Amino acid sequence: IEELLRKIIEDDVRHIAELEDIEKWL
Amino acid sequence: IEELLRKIIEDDVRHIAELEDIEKWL
Amino acid sequence: IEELLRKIIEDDVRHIAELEDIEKWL
Amino acid sequence: IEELLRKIIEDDVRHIAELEDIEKWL
Ligand SMILES: [Zn+2]
Ligand SMILES: [Zn+2]
Ligand SMILES: [Zn+2]
Ligand SMILES: [Zn+2]
Ligand SMILES: [Zn+2]
Ligand SMILES: [Zn+2]
């Protein structure tokens, strides 16, 4: 479970970075 | 942007499945 | 923890619904 | 759309904090 949670966290960090970028492009 | 958002959607689909699985394990 | 996980799942379900909508608007 | 994406970002910020907290509890 620890490893699963770490992977989900890394995904959400990526989402924050990606959505902040889209925000800027818009 | 559309391709990006598709990838995010796919991630969230995986997150719901994994977190639901974790919730049952616990 | 169970309740926290359920809330995160509900958020991600909303994200899927919202991003599918944005997808369509774009 | 920009307002929507901001709300998603805010959610993911909460998710990273909560999942990290869960990861420590476990
Ligand atoms: Zn996310
Ligand atoms: Zn960038
Ligand atoms: Zn997620
Ligand atoms: Zn999400
Ligand atoms: Zn709608
Ligand atoms: Zn999330």
Pairwise CA distance, residues A18 & B23, whole Å = 28
Q: Tokens standing for B24?
A: 């049952």
Name chain D contacts of A20, Cβ cutoff 8 Å.
9
CA distance C17 to C1: 25
Joined together, the tokens standing for residue C16 give: 């899927």
User: In Å, how far is D4's CA from the nearest CA of chain A?
Assistant: 10
Rg (CA), chain A: 11
**Rounded-to-integer distance, Cα C22 and Cα B5, Å:** 9
CA distance D16 to A16: 10
Contacts of B8 (CB under 8 A, 6+ apart): A15, A18, A19, C15, C19
By what technique were these coordinates determined? X-ray
Backbone angles phi, psi at B24, to 5 degrees: -75, -45
Cα dist from A4 to A9, C25, D10, whole Å: 9, 33, 22
C-alpha to C-alpha distance for B2 and A9, rounded to whole angstroms:
23
The residue ranges of DSSP E strands in D1-26, in sequence order, are: none
Distance, CA of A25 to CA of B20 (rounded, Å): 34
Test C22 with D4 for CB contact under 8 angstroms.
Answer: yes
Nearest CA in chain C to B9: C16
